[PDB]
């Protein structure tokens, strides 16, 4: 119990590992990977076809009972051919436990909408469509939610520039707000911060 | 604090509380705005020996996730069922 | 025992006959589980936990002492969970998740850091 | 039920980028050179994609560096050269790829410093 | 542990039922609410007489920025650019070169006070206490341009406010 | 010290001054050019050199932890003074 | 090259959805001008709609066409329900952008942009 | 044919005879810390930052200088290894001056970075530090020799690469000093390179002095035109202005050096 | 509470207004008082506690009708419990340092930064490059005043 180091909890690590393979045994058709982090969080990585079967099972199964969708989001990794990682964070009140379910898609492949499983997923999928451009099939009402009306692009993609492409001002001649190509009085100053010395040997990739 | 006796009684009666004991305006009970200097303590790593950083390096103890299954007996739940909450004994019903 | 005036949860009505309702629901779940392949992990695990719950229902005629054994909250919460399990079992008949993995991911799909 | 689409991947019309910043840009795909001020090699592991530098000018009020190039700070990271090229192709950017530079393997020998008859004998330590 | 906020059955005896009828017909609980606002009418108000009286502040208050000097009059800032690096808003802009006596000193030090989030990171990062956030908060302007501070403005602020800044630093530096 | 250009505009301690013909000086018409008057290069020169009896002296700017990081200054060269790289104070080794 | 479709199995089905969208936009322009009190004519509005479809005429991937149609319907719904304001409808006409000549010499005189 | 099998943290690797422990670690993508070792200079083995444990060997070996032996298992991350690095870093920093805010190396300093990754996070040195007089070696390289860590890279480069036997060490012990002894200028056509190979801010570019910090520069990889060699260079710019020129490694052209006209 | 709790006008405006069932609240992703007003017994300070919430005693208020009035009573009672927690924090405040004694994460004290070489290096690097974090992803949540507040941090 060194004072500055976060203590381990092996009991939680063991319990989550056992449940991880329990889920893999029951849904082998869709489960591609199961892992538990060193701070005791369980992740199920699945084929995208399994979004509805897997999420239904975790919600309704008597030994799972993940009734609450805490969060639904996406991550963009341009180096992958399926660049978008879709992440579901679920909470089980009955068993006081959390689980993460992850799948993937590319710019042109639809993902089945999870609104039938969780009504909470409605706006989360609109946000993912808005910020990443991932289409969700059978969504009752898919449209932008955060961006401006008529906004072009998906800002949270890694290749969308920080300041975008257009900016707004009031123009007296046309007596309205107009959109024009972005110019910055002071360009954002890119910093190269990474140290050229490796920090964490435990995570070194093979050469 | 400068309210006359009659006014103190009037607002005490109207509110139904003894308001003079817990006034919402602050007077002389607050801390002085000048204070003596502090002398803060140091942490557990302030030692001259037996203190090698490698033995107290939380960041370097982090490990990649444990792969339970990859595509490269009794039923279980994620954890034991949550224990039912108890009613408060301080004040069970408001 | 004296009847519950409320379950405490908005919209969850008290059940007047919880033992009978639970026996019906678990029996239905076992029936539906019979059309799933015998070696499918879902059937084996759900049969095991369903039979445990059903055994506890038969062996305990008191609701409050039954709620303690079931460890699922109010008895009306256990009934709702039994109904949710039945609905899932019917769906898993049409999904057949016990079949082999439909497709492997690309090479570096789950590699982090990149 | 799946479908067959044999054409090349071209998402240039559903990314919302202005046409000027698709067809007039030049992406450079490279592995960053080691900073010669330091010996660490940890920043020469991954492939980078950057775009061609454009005009910066002085702001009249303050003298700050102004730009009209939305891509001036855009840098993407890729595991392999093939990943970077594939990303550039589908987004419609012309690109140059520079082959990775790996330090030559050297023959080091402390003993050579004290050679009997060779020029590698060092005059100081 | 938990408690119920609203789970109580009213008594159905004749006195209780008649107490509730009086409350309904004679508006007793509404009259009680009138008593509370009446008691406030006769309390001393909490208002202070700004600008003749001021709200209290502490030595840690983060206000207008200033560039400081050593007692000799030399500038403290040696153009390390730690403040510029840490600034969450990128509100700081710095240029530097050797001074005519070889000193390491800035030729530009701008803070865009309309970018700045007044977070105090710059004064935490400074190794020599050159850049600080002073105690002034009454510097609203009539134009946007007046809030783009260059080095001359920031040095004047330091010269203007140093007497208070030094006393504030004295009060709090043992907590840093 | 703060000089003035042949146009009358004051020259800052960084040597800045709009030249004769730079339109940008219109921003000062009806207003003023902010210029700090206490030039730190002149102020630090006013300080006297401190005579010390050791080859190496240390400086922290004064004020303890209110000064600058403590540095050590070598005073072996007699042709010049050691200067603090942080605060600019000067030191010399007596005989 | 076996990929999951969005809506259209092939370009023939996609071009049907494109024509349906074009009709919906074409009928809508008269209402948009009237409702938003725009100072342009229905002819200019429909010419602009035509110009927007034309820029994408070179696509051959049905999935890309489907996404363009999905966005087109989203854009149309924003307009019909007056979620857009007049400023949004008029952003298609870029009335405040000065001409940017597109010949080598003109660019050469103004700067370094190719 | 004559390759021998060695292990880096239990991972087998086949290496030519004469390969050092440091070079063996490179093959598995592990970079041993170093200060005195430069792969293009003669081996020195004096900083001791490369000390690494060999399994079953009671003594840590200098990885930069020690040839590998068949079957050796190099424990690049053992407590014995980590404690050796911490001890050496502590000695390196004992007399080093608190100059980071005023030192041009700040932000791209091997001493800073390796102290972060391999050293302790605090000091237990309660004495006064050494202070050294600076030495004028010309208009291109400024010397702040109190920052020198006596790695001798500059001496070896000047002798071996530049072919100038002007730099050396005088005195001995803690008072050992790198320099020219007499008043001399190191004005070789390759002199500026010693700025790059000096790991600390002891040797810095006079023209570049104080103008920028590493993290704020943009690196444009380009080519030199000051002659016909075509040396690969990095043009460092900031806010629309060229700040300095750095070499870019090209084994078949300029290796990792540039001429002083290029620089 | 004198102004509102028993006020018949206030009750008319809030009683039986905006009823959400416990089942709907869960499926819609509600949290905090939006769950507890409908009778769900859930509070992350009790069930998934953090920094020292397991060492303090307090009661979670629970509603019975899942309407605005019950959610208003829950928020009023949560203020009283906050005062109860604050009292225990005032009495049980321990001595010691206030940031982790590990200068590769938390900056050194200013006096150390100005005396010790290691401290100055670490101060310099923490305020420029910043500390590196080992690769990984976490979803962390707290019982924020408005409900479950979390971050998915990669
Ligand atoms: C139309 C109506 C107005 C016309 C009649 C005007 C009658 C004269 C008013 C005299 C007020 C002057 C107060 C005073 O002396 O200043 C003290 C003050 C110095 O005393 P202090 O240090 O502040 O201490 C204040 C008390 O400690 C703290 O203050 P306090 O709350 O303790 O008040 C002290 C005193 C102050 O009261 C008075 O002196 C005037 C009372 C007249 C009541 C009329 C209604 O009141 C009492 O002692 C209680 C008896 C007064 C009757 C209270 C009955 C309340 C209503 C019952 C509840 C239910 C309502 C339904 O000096 C001033 O500030 C001078 C300011 C002058 C203001 C203008 C006054 C004239 C008002 C208009 C005149 C008509 C035109
Ligand atoms: C000899 C035999 C004699 C025979 C005759 C005997 C007659 C006397 C006995 C009969 C009862 C007398 C009192 C009747 C007064 C009127 C009562 C009334 O209407 O108020 C009840 C009303 C009910 O509303 P609620 O409480 O929400 O629930 C009702 C459920 N349907 O609730 C309300 O109206 C609430 C009103 C809300 C708005 C109030 C805002 C102002 C409150 C402060 C006013 C204070 C009174 C000031 C009067 C000043 C007059 C100058
Ligand atoms: S207070 Fe914060 S935002 Fe403002 S200049 Fe300082 S670091 Fe930047
Ligand atoms: S104000 Fe302080 S932190 Fe900023 S550049 Fe000057 S010395 Fe460095
Ligand atoms: S050489 Fe490195 S550690 Fe030494 S003062 Fe300069 S930046 Fe700091
Ligand atoms: S001056 Fe630099 S390169 Fe030369 S010995 Fe000292 S630290 Fe090494
Ligand atoms: S790198 Fe081996 S001793 Fe210096
Ligand atoms: K150097
Ligand atoms: Zn000094």
UniProtKB/Swiss-Prot annotation, chain A:
Membrane topology classification: Peripheral membrane protein
GO cellular component assignments: mitochondrial inner membrane; mitochondrial membrane; respiratory chain complex I
E.C. no: 7.1.1.2
Localization of this protein: Mitochondrion inner membrane
GO molecular-function terms, A-Z: NADH dehydrogenase (ubiquinone) activity; NADH dehydrogenase activity
Alphabetized UniProt keyword annotations: Electron transport, Membrane, Mitochondrion, Mitochondrion inner membrane, NAD, Oxidoreductase, Respiratory chain, Transit peptide, Translocase, Transport, Ubiquinone
Reactions this protein catalyses: a ubiquinone + NADH + 5 H(+)(in) = a ubiquinol + NAD(+) + 4 H(+)(out)
An annotated GO BP: reactive oxygen species metabolic process
General function of this protein: Core subunit of the mitochondrial membrane respiratory chain NADH dehydrogenase (Complex I) which catalyzes electron transfer from NADH through the respiratory chain, using ubiquinone as an electron acceptor. Essential for the catalytic activity and assembly of complex I.
Top enzyme class: translocase
Gene: NDUFS3
UniProt subunit comment: Core subunit of respiratory chain NADH dehydrogenase (Complex I) which is composed of 45 different subunits. Interacts with NDUFAF3. Interacts with RAB5IF. Found in subcomplexes containing subunits NDUFS2, MT-ND1 and NDUFA13.
UniProt organism field: Bos taurus
Presence of the UniProt keyword rRNA processing in the record: no
Protein name listed in UniProt: NADH dehydrogenase [ubiquinone] iron-sulfur protein 3, mitochondrial
Curated annotation (Swiss-Prot), chain B:
Swiss-Prot/TrEMBL GO biological process terms: ATP synthesis coupled electron transport; mitochondrial electron transport, NADH to ubiquinone
Main location: mitochondrion
Domain of life: Eukaryota
Ranges for region Disordered: 31-51, 73-94
Keyword set includes Kinase: no
GO MF annotations in UniProt: oxidoreductase activity
Entries under InterPro entries matching the protein: NDUA7
Subunit-level organization: Complex I is composed of 45 different subunits.
Role description: Accessory subunit of the mitochondrial membrane respiratory chain NADH dehydrogenase (Complex I), that is believed not to be involved in catalysis. Complex I functions in the transfer of electrons from NADH to the respiratory chain. The immediate electron acceptor for the enzyme is believed to be ubiquinone.
Matches recorded under Pfam families: CI-B14_5a
N-acetylalanine: residues bearing it: 1
Keywords attached to this entry: Acetylation, Electron transport, Membrane, Mitochondrion, Mitochondrion inner membrane, Respiratory chain, Transport
Entry-linked PANTHER family: NADH DEHYDROGENASE [UBIQUINONE] 1 ALPHA SUBCOMPLEX SUBUNIT 7, NADH-UBIQUINONE OXIDOREDUCTASE SUBUNIT B
Chain positions found as N6-acetyllysine: 39
Protein name according to UniProt: NADH dehydrogenase [ubiquinone] 1 alpha subcomplex subunit 7
Family: Belongs to the complex I NDUFA7 subunit family.
UniProtKB/Swiss-Prot annotation, chain H:
Subcellular location: Mitochondrion inner membrane
UniProt modified residues of type N6-acetyllysine: 56
Residue stretches making up the 4Fe-4S Mo/W bis-MGD-type domain: 217-263
Purpose of the protein: Core subunit of the mitochondrial membrane respiratory chain NADH dehydrogenase (Complex I) which catalyzes electron transfer from NADH through the respiratory chain, using ubiquinone as an electron acceptor. Essential for catalysing the entry and efficient transfer of electrons within complex I. Plays a key role in the assembly and stability of complex I and participates in the association of complex I with ubiquinol-cytochrome reductase complex (Complex III) to form supercomplexes.
Domain of life: Eukaryota
Domain 2Fe-2S ferredoxin-type, residue spans: 2-80
Amino acids binding [4Fe-4S] cluster 2: 148, 151, 154, 198
UniProt binding sites for [4Fe-4S] cluster 1: 96, 100, 103, 109
Residue stretches making up the 4Fe-4S His(Cys)3-ligated-type domain: 80-119
Assembly information from the UniProt record: Core subunit of respiratory chain NADH dehydrogenase (Complex I) which is composed of 45 different subunits. This is the largest subunit of complex I and it is a component of the iron-sulfur (IP) fragment of the enzyme. Complex I associates with ubiquinol-cytochrome reductase complex (Complex III) to form supercomplexes. Interacts with MDM2 and AKAP1.
Sequence similarity: Belongs to the complex I 75 kDa subunit family.
Residues of the full protein shown: 29 to 291 of 727
Gene: NDUFS1
Residues that bind [2Fe-2S] cluster: 36, 47, 50, 64
Protein's name according to its UniProt entry: NADH-ubiquinone oxidoreductase 75 kDa subunit, mitochondrial
Swiss-Prot record, chain I:
Binding site for [4Fe-4S] cluster: 68, 74, 89
Subcellular location per the Swiss-Prot or TrEMBL entry: Mitochondrion inner membrane
Described function: Core subunit of the mitochondrial membrane respiratory chain NADH dehydrogenase (Complex I) which catalyzes electron transfer from NADH through the respiratory chain, using ubiquinone as an electron acceptor. Essential for the catalytic activity and assembly of complex I. Redox-sensitive, critical component of the oxygen-sensing pathway in the pulmonary vasculature which plays a key role in acute pulmonary oxygen-sensing and hypoxic pulmonary vasoconstriction. Plays an important role in carotid body sensing of hypoxia.
Subunit structure of this chain's protein: Core subunit of respiratory chain NADH dehydrogenase (Complex I) which is composed of 45 different subunits. Component of the iron-sulfur (IP) fragment of the enzyme. Interacts with NDUFAF3. Interacts with NDUFAF7. Interacts with CERS2.
Family, similarity comment: Belongs to the complex I 49 kDa subunit family.
Protein name as catalogued: NADH dehydrogenase [ubiquinone] iron-sulfur protein 2, mitochondrial
Portion of the full-length sequence here: 259 to 412 of 463
């Amino acid at each position: 119990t060194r004072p500055t180091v976060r203590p381990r909890n092996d009991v939680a690590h063991k319990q989550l590992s056992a449940f991880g393979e329990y889920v893999a045994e029951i849904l082998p058709k869709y489960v591609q990977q199961v892992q538990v982090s060193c701070f005791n969080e369980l992740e199920i990585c699945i084929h995208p076809d399994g979004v509805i079967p897997v999420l239904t099972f975790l919600r309704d199964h008597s030994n799972a009972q993940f009734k609450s969708l805490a969060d639904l989001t996406a991550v963009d990794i341009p180096t992958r051919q399926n660049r978008f990682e879709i992440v579901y964070n679920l909470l089980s009140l009955r068993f006081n436990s959390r689980i993460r379910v992850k799948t993937y898609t590319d710019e042109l492949t639809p993902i089945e909408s999870s609104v039938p499983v969780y009504k909470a997923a409605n706006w989360y999928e609109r946000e993912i469509w808005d910020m990443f451009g991932v289409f969700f099939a059978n969504h009752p009402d898919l449209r932008r939610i955060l961006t401006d009306y008529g906004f072009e692009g998906h800002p949270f993609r890694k290749d969308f520039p920080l300041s975008g492409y257009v900016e707004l001002r009031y123009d007296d001649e046309v007596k309205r707000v107009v959109a024009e190509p972005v110019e910055l009085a002071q360009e954002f100053r890119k910093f190269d911060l990474n140290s050229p010395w490796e920090a964490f040997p435990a995570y070194r990739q093979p050469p | 604090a400068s309210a006359t006796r009659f006014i103190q009684w009037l607002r005490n009666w109207a509110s139904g509380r003894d308001l003079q004991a817990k006034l919402q305006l602050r007077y002389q009970e607050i801390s002085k705005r000048t204070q003596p200097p502090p002398k803060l303590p140091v942490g557990p790593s302030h030692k001259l020996s037996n203190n090698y950083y490698c033995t107290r390096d939380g960041r370097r103890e982090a490990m990649p996730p444990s792969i339970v299954m990859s595509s490269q007996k009794k039923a279980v739940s994620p954890a034991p069922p949550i224990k039912r909450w108890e009613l408060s004994q301080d004040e069970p019903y408001l | 025992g004296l009847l519950k005036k409320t379950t405490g949860l908005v919209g969850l009505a008290v059940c007047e006959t919880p033992h009978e309702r639970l026996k019906i629901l678990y029996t239905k779940i076992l029936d539906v589980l019979g059309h799933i392949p015998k070696n499918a992990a879902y059937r084996k695990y759900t049969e095991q936990i369903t039979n445990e719950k059903l055994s506890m229902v038969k062996a305990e005629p008191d609701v409050k002492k039954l709620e303690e054994r079931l460890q699922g909250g109010q008895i009306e919460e256990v009934i709702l969970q039994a109904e949710n399990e039945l609905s899932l079992a019917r769906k898993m008949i049409q999904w057949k998740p016990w079949e082999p993995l439909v497709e492997e991911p690309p090479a570096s799909q789950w590699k982090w850091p990149i | 039920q799946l479908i067959t689409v044999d054409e090349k991947l071209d998402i240039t019309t559903i990314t919302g980028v202005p046409e000027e910043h698709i067809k007039t840009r030049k992406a450079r795909i490279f592995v960053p050179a080691r900073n010669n001020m330091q010996s660490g090699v940890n920043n020469t592991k991954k492939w980078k994609m950057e775009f061609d530098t454009r005009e910066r000018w002085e702001n009249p009020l303050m003298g700050w560096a102004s730009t009209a190039d939305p891509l001036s700070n855009l840098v993407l990271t890729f595991s392999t050269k093939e990943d970077a090229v594939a990303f550039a192709e589908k987004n419609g950017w012309s690109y140059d790829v520079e082959e990775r530079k790996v330090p030559k393997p050297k023959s080091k020998s402390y003993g050579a410093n004290f050679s009997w008859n060779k020029r590698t004998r060092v005059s100081t330590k | 542990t938990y408690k119920y906020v609203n789970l109580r059955e009213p008594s159905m005896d004749m006195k209780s039922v008649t107490d509730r009828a009086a409350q309904t017909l004679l508006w007793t609980e509404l009259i009680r609410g009138l008593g509370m606002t009446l008691s406030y009418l006769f309390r001393e108000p909490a208002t202070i007489n700004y600008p003749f009286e001021k709200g209290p502040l502490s030595p840690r208050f983060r206000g207008e920025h200033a560039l400081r000097r050593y007692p000799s009059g030399e500038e403290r800032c040696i153009a390390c650019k730690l403040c510029e690096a840490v600034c969450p808003a990128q509100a700081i802009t710095i240029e530097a070169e050797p001074r005519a006596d070889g000193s390491r000193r800035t030729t530009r030090y701008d803070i865009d006070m309309t970018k700045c989030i007044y977070c105090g990171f710059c004064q935490e990062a400074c190794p020599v206490d050159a850049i600080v956030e002073g105690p002034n908060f009454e510097f609203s302007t009539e134009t946007h341009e007046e809030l783009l501070y260059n080095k001359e403005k920031l040095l004047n602020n330091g010269d203007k406010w140093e007497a208070e800044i030094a006393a504030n630093i004295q009060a709090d530096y043992l907590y840093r | 010290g703060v000089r003035t250009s042949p146009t009358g505009e004051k020259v800052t301690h960084t040597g800045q001054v709009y030249d004769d013909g730079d339109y940008r000086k219109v921003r000062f018409v009806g207003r003023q050019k902010e210029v700090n008057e206490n030039f730190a290069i002149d102020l630090i020169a006013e300080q006297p050199v401190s005579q010390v009896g050791s080859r190496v002296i240390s400086c922290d700017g004064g004020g303890g932890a209110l000064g600058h990081p403590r540095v050590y200054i070598n005073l072996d060269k007699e042709t010049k003074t050691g200067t603090c790289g942080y605060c600019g104070l000067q030191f010399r080794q007596q005989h | 090259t076996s990929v999951k479709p969005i809506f259209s199995r092939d370009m023939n089905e996609a071009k049907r959805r494109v024509r349906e969208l074009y009709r919906a936009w074409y009928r809508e322009v008269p209402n948009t001008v009237h409702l938003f009190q725009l100072d342009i004519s229905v002819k200019q509005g429909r010419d602009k709609v035509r110009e927007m479809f034309k820029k994408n005429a070179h696509i051959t991937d049905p999935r890309v066409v489907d996404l363009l149609v999905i966005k087109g319907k989203m854009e149309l719904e924003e307009t019909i329900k007056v979620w857009k304001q007049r400023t949004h409808v008029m952003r298609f006409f870029h009335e405040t952008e000065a001409p940017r000549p597109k010949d080598f010499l003109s660019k050469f005189y103004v700067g370094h942009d190719p | 044919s004559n390759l021998i099998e060695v292990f880096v943290d239990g991972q087998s690797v086949m290496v030519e005879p004469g390969t050092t422990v440091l070079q063996a670690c490179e093959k598995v993508g592990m970079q041993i810390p170093r200060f005195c070792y430069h792969e293009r200079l003669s081996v020195a083995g004096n900083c001791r930052m490369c000390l690494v444990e060999i399994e079953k060997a009671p003594k840590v070996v200098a990885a930069c200088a020690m040839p590998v032996m068949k079957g050796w298992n190099i424990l690049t991350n053992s407590e014995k290894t980590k404690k050796a690095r911490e001890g050496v870093m502590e000695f390196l920093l004992a007399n080093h001056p608190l100059d980071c805010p005023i030192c041009d190396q700040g932000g791209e300093c091997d001493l800073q970075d390796q102290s972060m990754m391999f050293g302790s996070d605090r000091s237990r040195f309660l004495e006064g530090k050494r202070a050294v007089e600076d030495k004028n070696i010309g208009p291109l390289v400024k010397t702040i020799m109190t920052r020198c860590i006596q790695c001798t890279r500059c001496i070896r480069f000047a002798s071996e690469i530049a072919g100038v036997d002007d730099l050396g060490t005088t005195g001995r012990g803690n008072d050992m000093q790198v320099g020219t002894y007499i008043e001399k200028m190191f004005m070789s056509e390759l002199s500026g390179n010693i700025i790059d190979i000096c790991p600390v801010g002891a040797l810095t570019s006079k023209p570049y002095a104080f103008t920028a910090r590493p993290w704020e520069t943009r690196k444009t990889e380009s080519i030199d035109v000051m002659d016909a060699v075509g040396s690969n260079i990095v043009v460092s710019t900031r806010t629309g202005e060229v700040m300095r020129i750095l070499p870019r490694m090209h084994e078949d052209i300029n290796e990792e050096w540039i001429s002083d006209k290029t620089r | 509470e004198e102004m509102l709790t028993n006020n018949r006008i206030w009750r008319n405006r809030t009683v039986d207004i905006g009823i959400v069932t416990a089942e709907d609240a869960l499926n819609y992703g509600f949290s905090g008082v939006m769950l507890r007003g409908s009778g769900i017994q859930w509070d992350l300070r009790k069930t998934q506690p953090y920094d020292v919430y397991d060492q303090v005693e307090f009661d979670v208020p629970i509603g019975s009708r899942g309407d605005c009035y019950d959610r208003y009573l829950c928020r009023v009672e949560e203020m009283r419990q906050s005062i109860r927690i604050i009292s225990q924090c005032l009495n049980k405040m321990p001595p010691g340092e206030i940031k982790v004694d590990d200068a590769k994460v938390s900056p050194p004290k200013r006096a150390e930064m100005k005396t010790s070489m290691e401290s100055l290096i670490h101060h310099f690097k923490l305020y420029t490059e910043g500390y590196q974090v080992p690769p990984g992803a976490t979803y962390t949540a707290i019982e924020a005043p408005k409900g479950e507040f979390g971050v998915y941090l990669v």
